[PDB]
Design a protein around this ligand. Structure first.
Ligand SMILES: NC(=O)c1nc(-c2ccc(C(=O)O)cc2)nc2c1[nH]c(=O)n2-c1ccccc1
Length: 334
């Protein structure tokens, strides 16, 4: 009597009906470009796993971004490369332009198209209702694509959505946690930023799917239209589920748990307490009301659901009335 299994309700078998070489990234043989084409200009940041630099391609003088991988699992490097190659050319997917190694030290690096992303304090002060609808649509294009290509991103958050606002240009980046979906597979629940973790991760339910990304997207939407980043602000993973339950209510949480026969740490029930489900209207104020509409709230309500099987797919999301004005305007013959 363990947890009830689950499988994605869409794109369930997309990797099943593809050649082994598509999803078997361990078998992937890398063709390396030339390290000496790129000059590092400045360090942009660093994670547990890598350091990221602004760089110049000296053959054509174009800016790029170089991510140098610290000596981690060769498996995870091949996984990320295979995913990036599989998704290359997809809508709003960051373009992997090159892969290079030091021939002597054997350290690999990924080379990406450069995105001149807008400051954020600037975006926070000027994004309109239409802007948000537009960029949400563009994110959904990316997620529907990678999901249709059998891949879960698993780290959707504002920092991984780069926006060059003056060119109305968006890219979904940081595919380092992304993974192929195979039905019935149990996955690591230690993915996504705390604030963007779905309830399935927080209750250690491992047989999750693409719908994880839709929870994360809902958190981003809430953060944007209510002007509170992050929207659910827990101080640890336990507290994160408490923050969700204070909004979504504990009754639906326990129904979720009950449906999948999930067992909670006894301490969770003590700290989860008892909370009513709130109305989304509660978070609307004079300062954010210009970004909020009935359509926005209906849409949000269909993303932020405990049951992962209940959330909108990316395709279904793109069909929502919230996007009516955007979809009209993008019907272009160019
Ligand atoms: N194109 C850019 O402009 C660009 N691309 C990436 C990027 C990273 C990883 C991956 C990946 O691993 O898939 C893809 C793309 N990261 C960027 C970036 N511009 C930028 O300031 N950072 C950044 C900032 C702070 C901390 C870390 C990174």
């Amino acid at each position: 009597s363990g947890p009830v299994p689950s499988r994605a309700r869409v794109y369930t078998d997309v990797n099943t009906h593809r050649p082994r070489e598509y999803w078997d990234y361990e078998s992937h043989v890398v063709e390396w470009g030339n390290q000496d084409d790129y000059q590092l200009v400045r360090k942009l940041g660093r994670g547990k796993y890598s350091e990221v630099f602004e760089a110049i391609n000296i053959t054509n003088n174009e800016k790029v971004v170089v991510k140098i991988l610290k000596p981690v699992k060769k498996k995870k490097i091949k996984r990320e490369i295979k995913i990036l190659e599989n998704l290359r050319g997809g809508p709003n997917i960051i373009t992997l332009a090159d892969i290079v190694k030091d021939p002597v030290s054997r350290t690999p690096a990924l080379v990406f198209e450069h995105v001149n992303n807008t400051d954020f304090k600037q975006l926070y002060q000027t994004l309109t209702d239409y802007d948000i609808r537009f960029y949400m649509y563009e994110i959904l294009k990316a997620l529907d694509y990678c999901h249709s290509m059998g891949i879960m991103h698993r780290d959707v958050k504002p920092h991984n959505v780069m926006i060059d606002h003056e060119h109305r240009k968006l890219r979904l980046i940081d595919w380092g946690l992304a993974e192929f979906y195979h039905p019935g597979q149990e996955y690591n629940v230690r993915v996504a930023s705390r604030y963007f973790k779905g309830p399935e991760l927080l209750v250690d339910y491992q047989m999750y799917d693409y719908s994880l990304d839709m929870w994360s997207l809902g958190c981003m939407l809430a953060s944007m239209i209510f002007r509170k980043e992050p929207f659910f602000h827990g101080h640890d993973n336990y507290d994160q589920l408490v923050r969700i339950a204070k909004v979504l209510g504990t009754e639906d949480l326990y129904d979720y748990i009950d449906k999948y026969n999930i067992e909670l740490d006894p301490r969770f029930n003590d700290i989860l307490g008892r909370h009513s489900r709130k109305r989304w209207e509660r978070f609307v104020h004079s300062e954010n009301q210009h970004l909020v509409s009935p359509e926005a709230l209906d849409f949000l309500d269909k993303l932020l659901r405990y049951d992962h099987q209940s959330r909108l797919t990316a395709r279904e999301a793109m069909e929502h009335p919230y996007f009516y004005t955007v979809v009209k305007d993008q019907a272009r013959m160019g």
